[PDB]
């Protein structure tokens, strides 16, 4: 029984390899979205609002 089991395996392996032979014949820059690193290449409304804030803090002090 063990010899028969060993034979059955051998034949299956052989058939797979023959099919494969038959087919074969028929037929990086690294950049992460977690970084601001660009690849190579290289009045104001913020101060006005800041001036308005600075005025509030100075007045409170």
């Amino acid at each position: 029984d063990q010899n028969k089991l060993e034979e059955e395996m051998r034949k299956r392996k052989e058939r797979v390899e023959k099919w494969r032979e038959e087919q074969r014949k028929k037929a990086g820059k690294k950049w992460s979205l977690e970084d601001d690193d660009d690849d190579e290449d290289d009045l104001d409304p913020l101060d006005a609002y800041m001036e308005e804030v600075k005025e509030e803090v100075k007045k409170f002090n």
Binding site: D44, P45, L46, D47, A48, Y49, M50, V53
Partner: peptide, 19 residues
């Protein structure tokens, strides 16, 4: 208002980026 002001800044692109 601070946001609307900071990302219209013509002074530098860093302020707009940060806003």
């Amino acid at each position: 208002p601070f946001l609307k002001a900071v990302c219209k800044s013509k002074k530098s692109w860093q302020a707009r980026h940060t806003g």
